[PDB]
């Protein structure tokens, strides 16, 4: 089954470098030309740069020429893209897609078939911050609490209710970037019931500033 | 470079009905008799996949429902019936030239019926105002359309100033949106109101919800 | 919309009892007639229960005559299930499903038209145990690690790949029950330059133990 | 009572092919002419979907590519054309009398293409030898069919003794199975041998999948 997983993302700042691979499986790798694609919420998808099966042939979108490289490692299955220079501009999702030819009769046809996961890349001086976790405690047989997780840099942040025990009614909303600092906000419904005679608690983690908190939301009083 | 332009921009399709996406070329894109555009899929966290290919090629493993069309310029994606799983962003593309150019996607969306909002309100926490901040938070939650406008009055007042609205996609089982509204103010203008109000107009209903706290 | 939740399930001893909520929504409760419906392996889905909008009727199952007692409170929007003389046979996934009527032109026909998620409830005598996580550590372009959880009861654990981060190509396997213990593992691929360069640990919760541990993977040597 | 009696049991189906599974009860379930079969859809930690009531009436927001028929004693589902999203597990039910009855269900899966396993073997931890337990895991991944013949050797020996095999459902996007066979010894009985070996029979291929480590 064809497959590729992108990795090296990250948080760079504005004139750095950064390397991102992207591992396949599946398919005779050293026979395919590979494609990096990118994506941003202005940007939709945009074409990055392309190398064919031995790399004879290379081509780099305008925006990209002059700053990253496109590389493989047939032997490795690798697909690699060498960022430098790096400007906001620049941050988004990373795909690495393979570029597949349907044996037309009409002669083959190439049509980037397979894609993956994709990288976050974010390039910012803005500083790493580590957020703040707060209960949200009520003021019907259905009762909504949440946690409210600010100030912190960089995306993105996970959160979980009771372990992901409580999974079902559970809306976690995107964050929002309000002056280099994000903020985001969870809530998880649970028959009154259960609340409080059954703890409820949200389990935040921060990969970034390595910060892993569970806040339990107790009644307000 | 040629340009690809989608329309419209979003839709809303009931589930049996047929969606149709429009993706115009400014230059053409068949080269001899075969149109190189191409159609992608792309449901949220998910990375893109392979609609139709050539213009009305069915991509692997893609149900006869999606079907493509259009020559030269013009281009469109059909979708026949619409099902509860097809919820996604839809992309035109040529491979015609370099560089390899896409369309800025079309987000198709189940129209269900109208869902009202399930609004709730938090003031802030103890350990919030400890550290000097108050935020006061309000969910909006399971509505249907997302067309919503959340307001804020302190004490009476119209705030338009320190608010945060967020939204969620289309759920994935339910088709209904929710959102959350985020007042910040500091601990020591929270403590100069007394009453926080959070309001919603929505179009199932001529009154908003009015959901308020007095500190 | 038409919301059901059930609560109460749980770890009972054989000859004891519970009681199941269902807290309803979304619909004029006192209007319909509700049901409580089980599964378990050695079942499938097996009818327990059933009682009119009043009350004036209800109905139980062979096997939950004279122990179980359905009910409701129109008001509280909840209907209930109290189970006494439990016995393992009853260990089984309990959904209150709603009665809803299908307006016909023959007249109205009725049909469990909505259920909730369920509830756990297991009777067993077994003792109370946590788990213990052992690190899977490889002996490509793709390497697959892993976590094995074993001797804990009852079911369930959680298990998590870097906090939720690593979310795809994630194995989380059926428990088995050997001898009153349950035993899982679970399996994650990632690209074989991120380990060990970058940290890849299971985070393991097992609430009825109140036991939460995070193991990292770490080469053996 | 009445007994629903399913057909067949398992069912593994192409996607765009026609999925027809079979029901039938001990007594006749229609009432005069309206029969009370219901049909319910369940897809792995989900609760059942209402399907098809009344034998042949959709229910709600359910394609038209569901139908349900039959009268009296026998009754159908079918399902055309096959989807990505249809596996589950189906049942039917009886609502003329009391009790009400279900079938045992029947798992309809996704015929994709065969697909070897990937194995992967690990000994035991330093920390689970520290406690003197040594549990050998083996992880059989992404294959199909799921039938699969999975065997331990110790020294070259097999070893039906102490080994615990789990299956994953059919996966979601992949359409495949996956597997862990774990291999239980004590610390000193594990430090008693050298090879350790794990094996996997499966259609892809004649010769097994041998993966194995020298303790």
């Known amino acids: 089954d064809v497959q590729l997983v992108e990795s090296g993302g990250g948080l760079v700042q504005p004139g750095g470098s950064r390397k991102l691979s992207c591992a396949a499986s599946?398919?005779?790798?050293?026979?395919?030309?590979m494609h990096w694609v990118r994506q941003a919420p202005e940007k939709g998808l945009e074409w990055v740069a392309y190398?064919?099966?031995?790399?004879?042939?290379?081509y780099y979108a305008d925006t990209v020429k002059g700053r990253f490289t496109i590389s493989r490692d047939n032997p490795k299955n690798t697909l690699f893209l060498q960022m430098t220079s790096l400007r906001s501009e620049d941050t988004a999702l990373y795909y690495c897609?393979?570029?597949?030819?349907?044996?037309?009769?009409?002669?083959?046809?190439?049509?980037?078939?397979?894609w993956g996961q994709g990288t976050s890349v974010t390039v910012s001086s803005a500083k790493t911050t580590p957020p703040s976790v707060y209960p949200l405690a009520p003021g019907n047989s259905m009762v909504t609490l949440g946690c409210l997780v600010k100030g912190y840099f960089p995306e993105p942040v996970t959160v979980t209710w009771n372990s992901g025990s409580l999974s079902s009614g559970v809306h976690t909303f995107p964050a929002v970037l309000q002056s280099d600092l994000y903020t985001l906000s969870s809530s998880v419904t649970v028959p009154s019931s259960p609340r409080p005679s059954e703890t409820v608690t949200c389990n935040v983690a921060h990969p970034a500033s390595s910060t892993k908190v569970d806040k339990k939301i107790v009644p307000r009083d | 470079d040629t340009v690809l332009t989608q329309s419209p921009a979003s839709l809303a399709v009931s589930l049996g009905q047929r969606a149709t996406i429009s993706c115009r070329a400014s230059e053409s894109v068949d080269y001899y008799g075969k149109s190189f555009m191409n159609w992608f899929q792309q449901k949220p966290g998910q990375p893109p996949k392979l609609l139709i290919y050539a213009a009305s090629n069915q991509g692997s493993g893609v149900p006869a429902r999606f079907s493509g069309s259009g020559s030269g310029t013009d281009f469109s994606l059909h979708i026949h019936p619409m099902e509860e799983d097809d919820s996604a962003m839809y992309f035109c593309q040529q491979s015609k030239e370099v560089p390899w150019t896409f369309g800025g996607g079309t987000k198709l969306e189940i129209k269900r019926a109208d869902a009202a909002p399930t609004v709730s309100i938090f003031p802030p926490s103890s350990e919030q105002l400890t550290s000097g901040g108050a935020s006061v938070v309000c969910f909006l939650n399971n509505f249907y359309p997302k067309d919503i406008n959340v307001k804020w009055k302190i004490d009476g007042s119209e705030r338009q100033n320190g608010v945060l609205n967020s939204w969620t996609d289309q759920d994935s089982k339910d088709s209904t949106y929710s959102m959350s509204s985020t007042l910040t103010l500091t601990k020591d203008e929270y403590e100069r109101h007394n009453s926080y109000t959070c309001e919603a107009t929505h179009k199932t209903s001529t009154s908003p919800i009015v959901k308020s706290f007095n500190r | 919309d038409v919301q059901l939740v059930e609560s109460g399930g749980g770890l009972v001893q054989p000859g004891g009892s519970r009681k199941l909520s269902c807290?309803?929504?979304?619909?004029?409760?006192?209007?319909?007639?509700?049901?409580?419906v089980r599964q378990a392996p050695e079942k499938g889905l097996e009818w327990?229960?059933?009682?009119?909008?009043?009350?004036?009727?209800?109905?139980?199952?062979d096997t939950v005559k004279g122990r179980f007692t359905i009910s409701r409170d129109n008001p509280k929007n909840t209907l209930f299930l109290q189970m006494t003389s439990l016995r393992s046979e009853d260990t089984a996934l309990?959904?209150?499903?709603?009665?809803?009527?299908?307006?016909?032109?023959?007249?109205?026909?009725?049909?469990?038209?909505?259920?909730?998620?369920g509830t756990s409830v297991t009777v067993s005598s077994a003792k109370t145990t946590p788990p213990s996580v052992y690190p899977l550590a490889p002996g490509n372009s793709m390497v697959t690690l892993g976590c094995l959880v074993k001797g804990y009861f009852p079911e369930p654990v959680t298990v998590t790949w870097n906090s939720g981060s690593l979310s795809s190509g994630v194995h989380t396997f059926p428990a088995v029950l050997q001898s009153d213990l349950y035993t899982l593992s679970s399996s994650v691929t990632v690209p074989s330059s991120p380990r060990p360069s970058e940290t890849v640990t299971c985070n393991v919760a097992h609430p009825a133990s109140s036991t939460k541990v995070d193991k990292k993977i770490v080469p053996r040597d | 009572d009445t007994v629903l009696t399913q057909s067949p049991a398992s069912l593994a189906v192409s996607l765009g092919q026609r999925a027809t599974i079979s029901c039938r009860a001990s007594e006749s379930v229609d009432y005069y002419g309206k029969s009370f079969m219901n049909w319910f859809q369940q897809k792995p930690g989900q609760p059942p979907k209402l399907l098809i009531y009344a034998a042949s009436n959709q229910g709600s927001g359910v394609p038209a590519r569901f139908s349900g028929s039959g009268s009296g004693t026998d009754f159908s589902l079918h399902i055309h054309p096959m989807e990505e999203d249809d596996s589950a597990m189906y049942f039917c039910q009886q609502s003329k009398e009391v009790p009400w009855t279900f079938g045992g269900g029947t798992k309809l899966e996704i015929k994709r293409a065969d697909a070897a396993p990937t194995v992967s073997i690990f000994p035991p931890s330093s920390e689970q030898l520290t406690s003197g337990g040594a549990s050998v895991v083996c992880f059989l991944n992404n294959f199909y069919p799921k039938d699969i013949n999975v065997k331990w050797k110790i020294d070259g020996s097999e070893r039906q003794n102490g080994v615990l095999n789990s299956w994953t459902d059919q996966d979601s996007k992949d359409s495949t199975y996956s597997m862990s066979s774990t291999l239980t010894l004590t610390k000193d009985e594990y430090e008693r041998h050298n090879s350790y070996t794990c094996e996997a029979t499966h259609k892809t291929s004649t010769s097994p999948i041998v993966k194995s480590f020298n303790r």
């Open positions: 190398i064919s099966s031995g790399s004879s042939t290379i």
């Open positions: 599946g398919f005779t790798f050293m026979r395919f030309g």
């Open positions: 897609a393979r570029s597949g030819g349907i044996e037309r009769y009409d002669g083959t046809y190439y049509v980037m078939d397979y």
